[PDB]
Design a binder for this molecule. Sequence first.
Ligand SMILES: NC(=O)C1=CN([C@@H]2O[C@H](COP(=O)(O)OP(=O)(O)OC[C@H]3O[C@@H](n4cnc5c(N)ncnc54)[C@H](OP(=O)(O)O)[C@@H]3O)[C@@H](O)[C@H]2O)C=CC1
Ligand SMILES: Nc1nc2ncc(CNc3ccc(C(=O)N[C@@H](CCC(=O)O)C(=O)O)c(O)c3)nc2c(=O)[nH]1
Length: 159
Amino acid sequence: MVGLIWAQATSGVIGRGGDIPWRLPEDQAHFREITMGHTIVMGRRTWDSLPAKVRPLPGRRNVVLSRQADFMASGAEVVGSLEEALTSPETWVIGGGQVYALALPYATRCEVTEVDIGLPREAGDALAPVLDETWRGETGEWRFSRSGLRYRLYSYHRS
Ligand SMILES: NC(=O)C1=CN([C@@H]2O[C@H](COP(=O)(O)OP(=O)(O)OC[C@H]3O[C@@H](n4cnc5c(N)ncnc54)[C@H](OP(=O)(O)O)[C@@H]3O)[C@@H](O)[C@H]2O)C=CC1
Ligand SMILES: Nc1nc2ncc(CNc3ccc(C(=O)N[C@@H](CCC(=O)O)C(=O)O)c(O)c3)nc2c(=O)[nH]1
């Protein structure tokens, strides 16, 4: 089972300027709950974007995709291909835009947070993959974050 997990603005934006363009602590706790105890796979940029305090993310086997054969990330397994990254039975792909797109065909679950923030797409943003009609989804109820932003959770699956 390969799953993808991400949070997006309604527009599809997931990243800008090498970071995530909003604050939503409740969603980050959700991320931890889903991923804890599993292998997680991410692109090198997403690894770079993790706060030092949680790089690597604790309690998870951190796998990082890079085309730099020499790249080393403390506490992570650097691999050069998606094939080498997807060897664990349950794997969560945690981004970013490039790696979500790469892994989408391999995935049978998506755990998606929609963030109700006005954030029109800009050139060079990182974007969420678009889920087509092969996916079946359940839509959760809107909640307000302590940050003031409304958000909701989707669970998608395809067999
Ligand atoms: N809101 C959310 O849920 C999330 C948001 N983000 C945001 O996403 C953005 C980063 O996404 P993005 O810029 O797309 O970069 P990624 O995180 O997807 O990392 C891309 C890097 O992965 C490596 N890579 C890509 N394709 C391959 C391949 N086929 N084989 C081997 N290595 C490969 C390269 O590393 P190298 O260059 O070292 O070769 C490439 O530069 C940031 O802004 C981050 O904050 C990230 C995760 C979740
Ligand atoms: N839905 C959803 N998916 C994501 N998938 C990938 C990334 C990449 N960026 C991340 C991922 C995790 C953290 C992080 O600090 N996580 C900690 C703290 C958890 C907590 O605060 O309770 C942990 O998991 O232990 C981060 O600072 C950036 N983000 C999200 C995201 O924000 N939302």
